[PDB]
């Protein structure tokens, strides 16, 4: 089959990064998998004239014991961009945010059979490194289409198609969408009938060379996480000064949290335990006030153009809060997350995040990580399992877990 | 000879073209030298004779070896240097000794005449051209080409390393039970065979090198380990640092306290215990490398622990990979951490010490904390492995305060040990109001033209002072208002500010700052037996909050 030709966006380079150190295991991992996907022609070993590099890690399946290979494409994407993104981009249906069930299935293995244009297998090249630099390192590119890649997808568009189509025409309210190696698969039907549906896609996909997983997000079921208030029975100087405190925060955002009423209640110089009585205004003031809370703020909408952020506080007791936001304050979506390590829970959260993401809008947000970043670099893949990374900056919380937003 | 192997195919940077510079002219002596050089070079196959056709030009130099014996025939290639494309590197990271396994027979056979027996990409010969020009440039000189790897070209290193991998390939697959490594033109061999079966080996290599264009040693091998590599001095027992000699001068120049700084640190990799803080201390601060530099009481000790560690020679021990990883943290002195790697008890593979301090405020919890995470790090590029480790924390102190960290943390397995000091938090923020306890509202302004501000605070008690202060920020004000609230206050006390700033230093249990003040409030809080703080919105007019902020910015705000 005749290849696409890629071009990076004129002006930019290819990639550049390091290769962060691996454990023993994970090497010897790597070099088994690309030994053999060497044998297979899919990638081929190269010299120094290439001055390209990107990083390379071992994650697991879906808990399994195999060792999958997860190239991390980051940079190249952004290289790529125009690309994969204009000029043979993927429509995101707006309906998938609606289903009732979603179930994701790797078509990774898809793309290893789709050759890659000559002209651009340099640009993915990377490094399988070797312990206490005993070694060189192994040196490798792609031949065919890489799975972290982006542009995989894009190009594969085509044949993906083709072997959907049958499918859809006889299941029209299945939503199919394809986000850089899953396919998102969306329906309003029963469990079971949902379910089965899946499994008849899979023979579908199967007659093409695909196997297959499993994994199902109930989208529909996703709701807000409110700023919630107290409503306690006794009260201290202290509680209503906190109250008073985050309502004031409430203000810059979600337009309308009349405080004033609230507030000058029980002034001068008191001291903080002093318990304090109730007003009738006040009690209404609430009302209204988290009855604005409890929903989204008016005037903030999806701006297709620009970036999404994800910031995560730590609650405690293995509690995680997140927002999602393009504007600061402008919060798109909130949510929590709960139920061993720090590391391993925000990771699983990041994850989940970044998938609600994906099928809201389209795209995957930029974290503000509360943690070292060391730390981060040294242990995100010994929990990390989507074929996928976002793009993370380590940030360092304000004492803005008060107000849980 | 020249490798009968496949050649590395370069290119010049994109838009760019070869080389094209002037010949500068040279005398009779050293016309009459590279040309005596060049003739023996060609003779050989390195070089080859072209004509005027070739647009590209490279000055050639001449100078004289020891003493003046024999001419040398350097090749300024900056310019092509400039044009070539860019290639991977030779080395990302440097084998540590701690993380070669204990090896039985070691020898170090060096590859002679390396760049000059691999061919060059003939496409590419033809911009490595230069000029021997004739006495006062009458005649057009002589034009030579290169076939191998020129010396100071910057694909030489790559492809030569390259290159020199496939050669071995076959040899390693052949003799898996046998290591190799190669650092430039010398190759190290060793296994746990006998100096028989070693020496033999290394033949069979030699040869098989040899069947590639590559002439190596044969008696010369050098090989009598010991081994002086990179700073270090191996035997297949141990390793262990060159050995360090300490001055012993009268005056010290900040260049001698330098050499000096650099040599413990280096040494610091298998001595315990070095330590340069009080030395470094002198450093600070812009000075010449010629002036001299007194040593103070506390450096002048320092430098003592040191002279008395470095006395008796320290070896380090090889890594087993069966046996576990074992690493101790010791905390030496303020912000300075020692940790030492074993896998049996007190046979040190490694030493190593931390003393970053990681912006200003931090505790040891925190600093306890990084220096894990580097060891971590350290560890896994050496041995592929994380250690388990062995802290002076309480399992209480840490887990007592991860919980009630914003930040998240992590931390491998451990253990505690009790090797004083001992980690611990020099104290808490009650989170609950102290009932009973004086409430001081705190708070403070600041004229941004003139720096004039008043740190003042107002208690529930009626008590209400008021302090001016010169040349200070708005944040001093906010942060020396609470230095006061802590001083005329008692053991308890419950204090409200509006400064996010404030509350931020200092809910993170700072023990330790680079603010004078901070260290200040610091002591306050240790003495103090139960403290805690809260926020209001500044200058929102609030119950007490506003009352002091009238008192505080009533003129001169
Ligand atoms: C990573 O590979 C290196 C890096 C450096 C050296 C040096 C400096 O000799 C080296 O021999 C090697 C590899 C040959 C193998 N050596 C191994 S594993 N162990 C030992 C033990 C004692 C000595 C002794 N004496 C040298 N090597």
Same mark, same amino acid.
């Given at each position: 089959?005749?290849?696409?030709?890629?071009?990076?966006?004129?002006?930019?380079?290819?990639?550049?990064?390091?290769?962060?150190?691996? /454990?023993?295991?994970?090497?010897?991992?790597?070099?088994?998998?690309?030994?053999?996907?060497?044998?297979?022609?899919?990638?081929?070993?190269?010299?120094?004239?290439?001055?390209?590099?990107?990083?390379?890690?071992?994650?697991?399946?879906?808990?399994? /014991?195999?060792?999958?290979?997860?190239?991390?494409?980051?940079?190249?994407?952004?290289?790529?961009?125009?690309?994969?993104?204009?000029?043979?981009?993927?429509?995101?249906?707006?309906?998938?945010?609606?289903?009732?069930?979603?179930?994701?299935?790797?078509?990774?293995?898809?793309?290893?059979?789709?050759?890659?244009?000559?002209?651009?297998?340099?640009?993915?090249?990377?490094?399988?490194?070797?312990?206490?630099? &005993?070694?060189?390192?192994?040196?490798?590119?792609?031949?065919?289409?890489?799975?972290?890649?982006?542009?995989?997808?894009?190009?594969?568009?085509?044949?993906?198609?083709?072997?959907?189509?049958?499918?859809?025409?006889?299941?029209?309210?299945?939503?199919?969408?394809?986000?850089?190696?899953?396919? $998102?698969?969306?329906?309003?039907?029963?469990?079971?009938?949902?379910?089965?549906?899946?499994?008849?896609?899979?023979?579908?996909?199967?007659?093409?060379?695909?196997?297959?997983?499993? @994994?199902?997000?109930?989208?529909?079921?996703?709701?807000?996480?409110?700023? *919630?208030?107290?409503?306690?029975?006794?009260?201290?100087?202290?509680?209503? %000064?906190?109250?008073?405190?985050?309502?004031?925060?409430?203000?810059?955002?979600?337009?309308?949290?009349?405080?004033?009423?609230?507030?000058?209640?029980?002034?001068?110089?008191?001291?903080?335990?002093?318990?304090?009585?109730?007003?009738?205004?006040?009690?209404?003031?609430?009302?209204?006030?988290?009855?604005?809370?409890?929903?989204?703020?008016?005037?903030? @909408? $999806?701006?297709?153009?620009?970036?999404?952020?994800?910031?995560?506080?730590?609650?405690?007791?293995?509690?995680?809060?997140?927002?999602?936001?393009?504007?600061?304050?402008?919060?798109?979506?909130?949510?929590?997350?709960?139920?061993?390590?720090?590391?391993?829970?925000?990771?699983?959260?990041?994850?989940?995040?970044?998938?609600?993401?994906?099928?809201?809008?389209?795209?995957?947000?930029?974290?503000?990580?509360?943690?070292?970043? !060391?730390?981060?670099?040294?242990?995100?893949?010994?929990?990390?399992?989507?074929?996928?990374?976002? &793009?993370?900056?380590?940030?360092?919380?304000?004492?803005?877990?008060?107000?849980?937003? | 000879?020249?490798?009968?192997?496949?050649?590395?195919?370069?290119?010049?940077?994109?838009?760019?073209?070869?080389?094209?510079?002037?010949?500068?002219?040279?005398?009779?002596?050293?016309?009459?030298?590279?040309?005596?050089?060049?003739?023996?070079?060609?003779?050989?196959?390195?070089?080859?004779?072209?004509?005027?056709?070739?647009? $590209?030009?490279?000055?050639?130099?001449?100078?004289?070896?020891?003493?003046?014996?024999?001419?040398?025939?350097?090749?300024?290639?900056?310019?092509?240097?400039?044009?070539?494309?860019?290639?991977?590197?030779?080395?990302?990271?440097?084998?540590?000794?701690?993380?070669?396994?204990?090896?039985?027979?070691?020898?170090?056979?060096?590859?002679?005449?390396?760049?000059?027996?691999?061919?060059?990409?003939?496409?590419?010969?033809?911009?490595?051209?230069?000029?021997?020009?004739?006495?006062?440039?009458?005649?057009?000189?002589?034009?030579?080409?290169?076939?191998?790897?020129?010396?100071?070209?910057?694909?030489?290193?790559?492809?030569?390393?390259?290159?020199?991998?496939?050669?071995? &390939?076959?040899?390693?697959?052949?003799?898996?039970?046998?290591?190799?490594?190669?650092?430039?033109?010398?190759?190290?061999?060793?296994?746990?065979?006998?100096?028989?079966?070693?020496?033999?080996?290394?033949?069979?290599?030699?040869?098989?090198?040899?069947?590639?264009?590559?002439?190596?040693?044969?008696?010369?091998?050098?090989?009598?380990?010991?081994?002086?590599?990179?700073?270090?001095?191996?035997?297949?027992?141990?390793?262990?640092? %060159?050995?360090?000699?300490?001055?012993?001068?009268?005056?010290?120049?900040?260049?001698?306290?330098?050499?000096?700084?650099?040599?413990?640190?280096?040494?610091?990799?298998?001595?315990?215990?070095?330590?340069?803080?009080?030395?470094?201390?002198?450093?600070?601060?812009?000075?010449?490398?010629?002036?001299?530099?007194?040593?103070?009481?506390?450096?002048?000790? !320092?430098?003592?622990?040191?002279?008395?560690?470095?006395? &008796?020679?320290?070896?380090?021990?090889?890594?087993?990979?069966?046996?576990?990883?074992?690493?101790?943290?010791?905390?030496?002195?303020?912000?300075?951490?020692? $940790?030492?790697?074993?896998?049996?008890?007190?046979?040190?593979?490694?030493?190593?010490?931390?003393?970053?301090?990681?912006?200003?405020?931090?505790?040891?919890?925190?600093?306890?904390?990084?220096?894990?995470?580097?060891?971590?790090?350290?560890?896994?590029?050496?041995?592929?492995?994380?250690?388990?480790?062995?802290?002076?924390?309480?399992?209480?102190?840490?887990?007592?305060?991860?919980?009630?960290?914003?930040?998240?943390?992590?931390?491998?397995?451990?253990?505690?040990?009790?090797?004083?000091?001992?980690?611990?938090?020099?104290?808490?923020?009650?989170?609950?109001?102290?009932?009973?306890?004086?409430?001081?509202?705190?708070?403070?302004?600041?004229?941004?033209?003139?720096?004039?501000?008043?740190?003042?605070?107002?208690?529930?008690?009626?008590?209400?002072?008021?302090?001016?202060?010169?040349?200070?920020?708005?944040?001093?004000?906010?942060?020396?208002?609470?230095?006061?609230?802590?001083?005329?206050?008692?053991?308890?006390?419950?204090? *409200?500010?509006?400064?996010?700033?404030?509350?931020?230093?200092?809910?993170?249990?700072?023990?330790?700052?680079?603010?004078?003040?901070?260290?200040?409030?610091?002591?306050?809080?240790?003495?103090?037996?139960?403290?805690?703080?809260?926020?209001?919105?500044?200058?929102?007019?609030?119950?007490?909050?506003? %009352?002091?902020?009238?008192?505080?910015?009533?003129?001169?705000?």
């Amino acid at each position: 089959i005749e290849t696409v030709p890629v071009k990076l966006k004129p002006g930019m380079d290819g990639p550049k990064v390091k290769q962060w150190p691996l /454990t023993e295991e994970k090497i010897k991992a790597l070099v088994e998998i690309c030994t053999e996907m060497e044998k297979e022609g899919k990638i081929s070993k190269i010299g120094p004239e290439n001055p390209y590099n990107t990083p390379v890690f071992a994650i697991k399946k879906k808990d399994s /014991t195999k060792w999958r290979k997860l190239v991390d494409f980051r940079e190249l994407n952004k290289r790529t961009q125009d690309f994969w993104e204009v000029q043979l981009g993927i429509p995101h249906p707006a309906g998938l945010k609606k289903n009732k069930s979603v179930t994701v299935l790797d078509v990774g293995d898809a793309y290893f059979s789709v050759p890659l244009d000559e002209d651009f297998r340099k640009y993915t090249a990377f490094t399988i490194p070797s312990i206490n630099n &005993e070694t060189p390192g192994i040196r490798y590119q792609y031949n065919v289409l890489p799975q972290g890649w982006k542009g995989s997808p894009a190009i594969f568009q085509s044949s993906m198609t083709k072997i959907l189509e049958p499918f859809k025409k006889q299941n029209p309210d299945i939503v199919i969408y394809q986000y850089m190696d899953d396919l $998102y698969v969306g329906s309003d039907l029963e469990i079971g009938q949902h379910r089965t549906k899946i499994e008849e896609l899979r023979q579908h996909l199967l007659r093409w060379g695909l196997t297959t997983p499993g @994994y199902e997000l109930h989208p529909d079921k996703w709701t807000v996480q409110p700023i *919630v208030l107290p409503e306690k029975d006794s009260w201290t100087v202290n509680d209503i %000064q906190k109250l008073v405190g985050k309502l004031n925060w409430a203000s810059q955002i979600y337009p309308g949290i009349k405080v004033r009423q609230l507030c000058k209640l029980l002034r001068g110089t008191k001291a903080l335990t002093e318990v304090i009585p109730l007003t009738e205004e006040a009690e209404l003031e609430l009302a209204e006030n988290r009855e604005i809370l409890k929903e989204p703020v008016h005037g903030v @909408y $999806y701006d297709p153009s620009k970036d999404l952020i994800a910031e995560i506080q730590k609650q405690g007791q293995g509690q995680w809060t997140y927002q999602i936001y393009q504007e600061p304050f402008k919060n798109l979506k909130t949510g929590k997350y709960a139920r061993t390590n720090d590391v391993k829970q925000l990771t699983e959260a990041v994850q989940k995040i970044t998938t609600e993401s994906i099928v809201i809008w389209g795209k995957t947000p930029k974290f503000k990580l509360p943690i070292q970043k !060391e730390t981060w670099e040294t242990w995100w893949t010994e929990y990390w399992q989507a074929t996928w990374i976002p &793009e993370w900056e380590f940030v360092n919380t304000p004492p803005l877990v008060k107000l849980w937003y | 000879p020249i490798s009968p192997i496949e050649t590395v195919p370069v290119k010049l940077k994109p838009g760019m073209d070869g080389p094209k510079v002037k010949q500068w002219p040279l005398t009779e002596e050293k016309i009459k030298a590279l040309v005596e050089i060049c003739t023996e070079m060609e003779k050989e196959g390195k070089i080859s004779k072209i004509g005027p056709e070739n647009p $590209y030009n490279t000055p050639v130099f001449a100078i004289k070896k020891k003493d003046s014996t024999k001419w040398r025939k350097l090749v300024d290639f900056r310019e092509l240097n400039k044009r070539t494309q860019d290639f991977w590197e030779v080395q990302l990271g440097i084998p540590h000794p701690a993380g070669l396994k204990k090896n039985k027979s070691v020898t170090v056979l060096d590859v002679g005449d390396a760049y000059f027996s691999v061919p060059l990409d003939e496409d590419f010969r033809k911009y490595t051209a230069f000029t021997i020009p004739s006495i006062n440039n009458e005649t057009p000189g002589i034009r030579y080409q290169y076939n191998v790897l020129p010396q100071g070209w910057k694909g030489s290193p790559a492809i030569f390393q390259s290159s020199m991998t496939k050669i071995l &390939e076959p040899f390693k697959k052949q003799n898996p039970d046998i290591v190799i490594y190669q650092y430039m033109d010398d190759l190290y061999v060793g296994s746990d065979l006998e100096i028989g079966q070693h020496r033999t080996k290394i033949e069979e290599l030699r040869q098989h090198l040899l069947r590639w264009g590559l002439t190596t040693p044969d008696k010369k091998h050098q090989k009598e380990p010991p081994f002086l590599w990179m700073g270090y001095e191996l035997h297949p027992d141990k390793w262990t640092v %060159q050995p360090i000699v300490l001055p012993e001068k009268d005056s010290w120049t900040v260049n001698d306290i330098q050499k000096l700084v650099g040599k413990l640190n280096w040494a610091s990799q298998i001595y315990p215990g070095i330590k340069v803080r009080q030395l470094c201390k002198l450093l600070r601060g812009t000075k010449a490398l010629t002036e001299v530099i007194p040593l103070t009481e506390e450096a002048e000790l !320092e430098l003592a622990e040191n002279r008395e560690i470095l006395k &008796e020679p320290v070896h380090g021990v090889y890594y087993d990979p069966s046996k576990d990883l074992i690493a101790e943290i010791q905390k030496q002195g303020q912000g300075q951490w020692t $940790y030492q790697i074993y896998q049996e008890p007190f046979k040190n593979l490694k030493t190593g010490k931390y003393a970053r301090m990681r912006g200003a405020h931090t505790n040891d919890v925190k600093q306890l904390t990084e220096a894990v995470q580097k060891i971590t790090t350290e560890s896994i590029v050496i041995w592929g492995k994380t250690p388990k480790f062995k802290l002076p924390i309480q399992k209480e102190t840490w887990e007592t305060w991860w919980t009630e960290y914003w930040q998240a943390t992590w931390i491998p397995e451990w253990e505690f040990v009790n090797t004083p000091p001992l980690v611990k938090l020099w104290y808490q923020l009650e989170k609950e109001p102290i009932v009973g306890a004086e409430t001081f509202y705190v708070d403070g302004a600041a004229n941004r033209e003139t720096k004039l501000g008043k740190a003042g605070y107002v208690t529930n008690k009626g008590r209400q002072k008021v302090v001016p202060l010169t040349n200070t920020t708005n944040q001093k004000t906010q942060l020396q208002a609470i230095y006061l609230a802590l001083q005329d206050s008692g053991l308890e006390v419950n204090i *409200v500010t509006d400064s996010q700033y404030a509350l931020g230093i200092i809910q993170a249990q700072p023990d330790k700052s680079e603010s004078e003040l901070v260290n200040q409030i610091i002591e306050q809080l240790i003495k103090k037996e139960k403290v805690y703080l809260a926020w209001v919105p500044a200058h929102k007019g609030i119950g007490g909050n506003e %009352q002091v902020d009238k008192l505080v910015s009533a003129g001169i705000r």
